Structures are given as structure tokens and as C-alpha cells.
Coordinates of C-alpha atoms and ligand atoms in Angstrom, one line a residue:
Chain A
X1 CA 99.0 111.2 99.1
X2 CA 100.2 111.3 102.4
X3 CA 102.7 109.1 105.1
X4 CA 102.7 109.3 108.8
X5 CA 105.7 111.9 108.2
X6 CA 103.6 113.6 106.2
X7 CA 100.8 113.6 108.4
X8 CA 102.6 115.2 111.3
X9 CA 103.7 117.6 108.6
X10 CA 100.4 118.6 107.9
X11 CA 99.1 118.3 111.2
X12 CA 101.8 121.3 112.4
X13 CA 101.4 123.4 109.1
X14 CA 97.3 123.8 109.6
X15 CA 97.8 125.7 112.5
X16 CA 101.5 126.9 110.8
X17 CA 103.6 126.1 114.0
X18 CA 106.9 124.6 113.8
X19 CA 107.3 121.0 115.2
X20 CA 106.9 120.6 119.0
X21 CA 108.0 117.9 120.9
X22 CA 105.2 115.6 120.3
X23 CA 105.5 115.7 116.3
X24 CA 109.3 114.9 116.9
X25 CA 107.9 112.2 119.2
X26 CA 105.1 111.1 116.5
X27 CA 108.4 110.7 114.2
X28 CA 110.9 108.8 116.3
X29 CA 107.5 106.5 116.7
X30 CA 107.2 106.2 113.0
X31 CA 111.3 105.8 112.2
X32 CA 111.1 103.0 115.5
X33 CA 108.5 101.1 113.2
X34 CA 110.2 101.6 109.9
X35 CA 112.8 98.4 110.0
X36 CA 110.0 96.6 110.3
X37 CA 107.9 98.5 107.7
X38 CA 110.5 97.9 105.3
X39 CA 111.0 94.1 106.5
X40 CA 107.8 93.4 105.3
X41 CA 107.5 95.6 102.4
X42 CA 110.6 93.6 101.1
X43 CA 109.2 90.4 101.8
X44 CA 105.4 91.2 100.3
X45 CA 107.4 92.6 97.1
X46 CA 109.4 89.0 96.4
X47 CA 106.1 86.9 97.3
X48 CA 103.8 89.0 96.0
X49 CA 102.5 86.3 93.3
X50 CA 102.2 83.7 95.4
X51 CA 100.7 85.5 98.2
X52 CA 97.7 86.0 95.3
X53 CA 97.9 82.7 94.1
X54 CA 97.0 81.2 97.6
X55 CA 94.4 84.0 98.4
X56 CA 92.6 82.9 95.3
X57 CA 93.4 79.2 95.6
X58 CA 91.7 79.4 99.5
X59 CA 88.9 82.0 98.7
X60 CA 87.7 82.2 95.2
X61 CA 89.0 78.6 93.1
X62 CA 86.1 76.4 92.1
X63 CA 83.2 78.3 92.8
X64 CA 80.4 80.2 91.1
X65 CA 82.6 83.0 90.1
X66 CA 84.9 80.7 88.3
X67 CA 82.4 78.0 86.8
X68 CA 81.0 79.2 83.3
X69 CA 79.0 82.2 83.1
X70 CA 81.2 83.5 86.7
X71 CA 82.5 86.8 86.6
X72 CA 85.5 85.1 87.4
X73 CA 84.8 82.4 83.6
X74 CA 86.5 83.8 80.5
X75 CA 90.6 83.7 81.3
X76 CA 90.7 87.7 80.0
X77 CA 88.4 88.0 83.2
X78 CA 90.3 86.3 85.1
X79 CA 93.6 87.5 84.6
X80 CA 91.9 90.6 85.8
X81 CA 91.0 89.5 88.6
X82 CA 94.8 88.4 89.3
X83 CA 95.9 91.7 88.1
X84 CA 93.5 93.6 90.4
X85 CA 94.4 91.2 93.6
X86 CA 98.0 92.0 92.9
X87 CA 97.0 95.9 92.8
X88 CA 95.4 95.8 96.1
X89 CA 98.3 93.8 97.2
X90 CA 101.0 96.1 95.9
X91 CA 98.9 99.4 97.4
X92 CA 98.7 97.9 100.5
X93 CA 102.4 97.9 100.9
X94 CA 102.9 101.3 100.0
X95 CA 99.7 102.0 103.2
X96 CA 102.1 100.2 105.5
X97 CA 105.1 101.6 104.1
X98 CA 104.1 105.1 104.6
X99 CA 102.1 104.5 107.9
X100 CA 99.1 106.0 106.3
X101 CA 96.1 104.8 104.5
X102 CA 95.5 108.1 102.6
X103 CA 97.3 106.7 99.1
X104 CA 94.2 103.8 99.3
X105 CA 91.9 106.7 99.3
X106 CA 93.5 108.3 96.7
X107 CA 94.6 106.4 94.0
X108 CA 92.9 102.8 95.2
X109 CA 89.5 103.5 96.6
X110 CA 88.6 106.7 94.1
X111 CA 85.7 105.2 91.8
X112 CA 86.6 101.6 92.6
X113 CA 83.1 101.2 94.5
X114 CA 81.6 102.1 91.2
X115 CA 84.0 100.6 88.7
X116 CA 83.1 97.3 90.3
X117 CA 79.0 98.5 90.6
X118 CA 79.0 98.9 87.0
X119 CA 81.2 96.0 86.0
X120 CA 79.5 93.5 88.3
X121 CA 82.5 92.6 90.1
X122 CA 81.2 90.9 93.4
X123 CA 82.4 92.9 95.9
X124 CA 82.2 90.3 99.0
X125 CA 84.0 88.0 97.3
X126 CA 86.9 90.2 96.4
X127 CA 86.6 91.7 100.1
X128 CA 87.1 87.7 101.4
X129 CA 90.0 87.8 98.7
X130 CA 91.5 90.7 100.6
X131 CA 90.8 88.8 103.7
X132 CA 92.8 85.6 102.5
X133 CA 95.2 87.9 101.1
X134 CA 95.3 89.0 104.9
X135 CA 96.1 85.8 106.2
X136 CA 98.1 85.2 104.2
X137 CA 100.8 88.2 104.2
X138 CA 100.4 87.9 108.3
X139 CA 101.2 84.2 108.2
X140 CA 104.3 85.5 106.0
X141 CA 105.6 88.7 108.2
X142 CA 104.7 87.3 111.2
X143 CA 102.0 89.0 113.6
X144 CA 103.3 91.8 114.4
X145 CA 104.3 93.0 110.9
X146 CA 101.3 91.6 109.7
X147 CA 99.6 93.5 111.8
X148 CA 100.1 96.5 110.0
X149 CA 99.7 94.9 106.4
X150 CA 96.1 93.3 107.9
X151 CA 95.1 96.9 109.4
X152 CA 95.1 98.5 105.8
X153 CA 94.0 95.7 103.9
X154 CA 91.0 95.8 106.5
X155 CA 90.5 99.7 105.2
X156 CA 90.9 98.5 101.7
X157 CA 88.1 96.0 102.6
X158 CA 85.7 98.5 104.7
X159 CA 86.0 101.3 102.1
X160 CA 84.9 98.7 99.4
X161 CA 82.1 97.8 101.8
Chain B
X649 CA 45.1 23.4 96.5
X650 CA 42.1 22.8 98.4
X651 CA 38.6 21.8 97.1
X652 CA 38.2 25.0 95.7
X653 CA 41.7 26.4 93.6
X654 CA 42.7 25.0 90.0
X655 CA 46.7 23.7 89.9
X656 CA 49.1 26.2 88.5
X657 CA 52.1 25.8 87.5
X658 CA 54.2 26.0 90.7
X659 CA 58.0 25.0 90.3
X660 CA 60.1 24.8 87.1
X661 CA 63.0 22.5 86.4
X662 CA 66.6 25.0 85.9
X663 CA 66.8 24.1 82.1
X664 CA 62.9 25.3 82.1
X665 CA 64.1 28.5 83.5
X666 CA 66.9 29.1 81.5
X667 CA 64.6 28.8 78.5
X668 CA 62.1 31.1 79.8
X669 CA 64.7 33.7 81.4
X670 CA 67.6 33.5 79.1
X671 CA 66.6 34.9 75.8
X672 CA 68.0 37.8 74.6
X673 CA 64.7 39.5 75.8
X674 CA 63.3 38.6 79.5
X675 CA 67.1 38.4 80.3
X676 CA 67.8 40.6 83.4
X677 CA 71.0 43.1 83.2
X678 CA 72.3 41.8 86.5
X679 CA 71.9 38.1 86.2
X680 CA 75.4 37.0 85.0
X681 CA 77.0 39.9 84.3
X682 CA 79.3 43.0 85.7
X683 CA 77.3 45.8 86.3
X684 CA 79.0 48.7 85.9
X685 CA 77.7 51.3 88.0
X686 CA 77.1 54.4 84.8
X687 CA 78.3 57.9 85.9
X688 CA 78.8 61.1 84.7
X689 CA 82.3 62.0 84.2
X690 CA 84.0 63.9 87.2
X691 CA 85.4 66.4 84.5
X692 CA 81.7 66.7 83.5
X693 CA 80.4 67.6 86.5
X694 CA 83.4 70.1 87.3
X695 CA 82.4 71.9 84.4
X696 CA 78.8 71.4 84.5
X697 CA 77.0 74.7 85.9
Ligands
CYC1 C1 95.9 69.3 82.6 C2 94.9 69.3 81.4 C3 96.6 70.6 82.8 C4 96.2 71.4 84.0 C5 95.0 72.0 84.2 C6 94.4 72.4 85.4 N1 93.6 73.6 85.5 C7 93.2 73.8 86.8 C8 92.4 74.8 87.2 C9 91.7 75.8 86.5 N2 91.7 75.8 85.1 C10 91.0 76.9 84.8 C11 90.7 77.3 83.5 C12 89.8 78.1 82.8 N3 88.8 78.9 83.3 C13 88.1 79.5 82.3 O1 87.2 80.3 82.5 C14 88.8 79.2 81.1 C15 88.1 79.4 79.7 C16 87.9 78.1 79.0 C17 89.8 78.3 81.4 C18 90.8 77.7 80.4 C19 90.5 77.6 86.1 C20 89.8 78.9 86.1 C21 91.0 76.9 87.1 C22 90.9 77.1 88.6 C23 89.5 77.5 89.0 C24 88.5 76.3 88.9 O2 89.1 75.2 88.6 O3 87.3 76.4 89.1 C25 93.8 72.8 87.5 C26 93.8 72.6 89.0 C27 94.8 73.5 89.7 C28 94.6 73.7 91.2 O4 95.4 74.0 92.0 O5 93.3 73.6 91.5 C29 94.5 71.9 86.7 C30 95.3 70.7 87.0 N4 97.2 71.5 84.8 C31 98.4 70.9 84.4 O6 99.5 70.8 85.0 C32 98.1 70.4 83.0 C33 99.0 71.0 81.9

């Protein structure tokens, strides 16, 4: 995967030159931003059920999926759909605890598109799911630290587009 | 009537009508009794597809 210190790593080692003053720069930007990084990492970590529970209550809770017949019907189903809301949830911390949305792409995004194709898993319903999960975690941080959590749960969202 | 209709039967004393109307057939639902308004059960419908 990869972090915004990572990235600047990379970013000097393509060409191979040692950091310059605008990687060290890039860096005391991403060290500035990480009390608050951590802030709401902590905080998304201790309300990470409920932050779910609401998303689902206010986005998916008596509707099609749920009624009988619902991707969302038959509780095995539907404690998968809690588990995979609290996956995107918990990956989405680590994207704004790094700075960089590369672990989505890597270990969140890789073959979800199809797992859900295949499985029938409504994908603009989980993306509004994201989206209350969105409101959610901003309403909780604030907007400022939400800010970050709604920036990569918005890439979690596009790349499932 | 004029000159030109037959008489009909055109008003009935209440015991009459009770006689007529107040058999177990010919009674109406509503005429002295609650009528409870039948519905399907909100839990019904909840589940109900
Ligand atoms: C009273 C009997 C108890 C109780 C029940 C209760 N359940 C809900 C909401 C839901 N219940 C289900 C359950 C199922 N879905 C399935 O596919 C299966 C397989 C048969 C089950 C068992 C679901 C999915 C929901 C939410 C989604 C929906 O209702 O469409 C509620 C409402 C809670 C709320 O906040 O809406 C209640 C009250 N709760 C208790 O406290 C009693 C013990």
C-alpha cells in the first residue's frame, strides 16, 4: 500500500534523488494534519458500530433489499452486509490515516466490483450506504475531520461506481 | 295516484318494518351494530412483499 509519507517517498526514489525541500515540505504538511488524522481515527474506531447501525437505519432499513426475497432478507445475508459496511468503514480509516487512498485500491476495491457483479449485491444502494456512512462519521469528527473520512469514502464510492 | 296509476303500498308502520327488515336475512350489517372497520394487520403488511 502506500501513505502520504510513502508517497513522497516514492515520488523522490522514481527519479532516485534525495528529498528536497518540497518533499520535507509535503511532510511537515502531512505530520501538521496527523493530530487530527489520529483524532478521528480514534473516534471512528470506538463508534464504529453505531456509525453502521445508523447508516443502515437511514439508508437501507425497510426497503426492498430487506423485505423477503431482498438481497438484504435471510439474517446470514444480512449480517453480511453489516460485516461488509464495517469493512469499508474500518478501510476508510486506515485511507485517512495514511493520507492516501492507495490501501482502497489495493486490498478494498481489487475484485469488489465483481464480487458484488456476481453476487448481486446492489451496488447503488451500498454506495448510498457509504454515503450515510459519510454523514455520519462527518457529523461525528466534525467538518473538518470529516472532511478527510468523506473524501475517501467518496473514492470508495466512485471506484464501486 | 291520478286517473291512470294503481295504489301501491306507500308507507309502513315501524313494527311493519322491523318485521320486514329485521330477520336474520334482509338485516343490514350497519343498522344497529358497531362496525368495525376490517384491516389487514400492520405486521402483515410489514412483511407482505
Ligand atoms: C419484538 C418482537 C422484538 C424486536 C423486533 C424488531 N425487529 C426490528 C427490525 C428488523 N427485524 C429484522 C429481521 C429479519 N429480517 C430477516 O430477513 C430475518 C429472517 C426471518 C429476520 C429475523 C430486520 C431485517 C429488521 C430491520 C429491517 C426491516 O425491518 O425491514 C425492529 C425495529 C427496529 C428499528 O429500529 O426499526 C424491531 C422492534 N425488537 C425487540 O426489542 C423485541 C425483542
Amino acid at each position: 500500500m502506500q501513505d502520504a509519507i510513502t508517497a513522497v517517498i516514492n515520488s523522490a526514489d522514481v527519479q532516485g534523488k534525495y528529498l528536497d525541500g518540497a518533499a520535507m515540505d509535503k511532510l511537515k504538511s502531512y505530520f501538521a494534519s496527523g493530530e487530527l488524522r489520529v483524532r478521528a481515527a480514534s473516534v471512528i474506531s470506538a463508534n464504529a458500530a453505531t456509525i453502521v447501525k445508523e447508516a443502515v437505519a437511514k439508508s437501507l432499513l425497510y426497503s426492498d433489499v430487506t423485505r423477503p426475497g431482498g438481497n438484504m432478507y435471510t439474517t446470514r445475508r444480512y449480517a453480511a452486509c453489516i460485516r461488509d459496511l464495517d469493512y469499508y468503514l474500518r478501510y476508510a480509516t486506515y485511507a485517512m490515516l495514511a493520507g492516501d487512498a492507495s490501501i482502497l485500491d489495493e486490498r478494498v476495491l481489487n475484485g469488489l466490483k465483481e464480487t458484488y457483479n456476481s453476487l448481486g449485491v446492489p451496488i447503488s444502494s451500498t454506495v448510498q450506504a457509504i454515503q450515510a456512512i459519510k454523514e455520519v462519521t462527518a457529523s461525528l469528527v466534525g467538518a473538518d475531520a470529516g472532511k478527510e473520512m468523506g473524501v475517501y469514502l467518496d473514492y470508495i464510492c466512485s471506484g464501486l461506481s | 295516484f291520478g286517473e291512470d296509476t294503481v295504489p301501491y303500498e306507500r308507507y309502513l308502520t315501524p313494527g311493519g318494518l322491523q318485521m320486514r327488515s329485521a330477520r336474520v336475512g334482509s338485516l343490514r350489517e350497519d343498522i344497529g351494530q358497531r362496525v368495525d372497520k376490517e384491516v389487514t394487520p400492520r405486521f402483515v403488511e410489514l412483511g407482505q412483499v
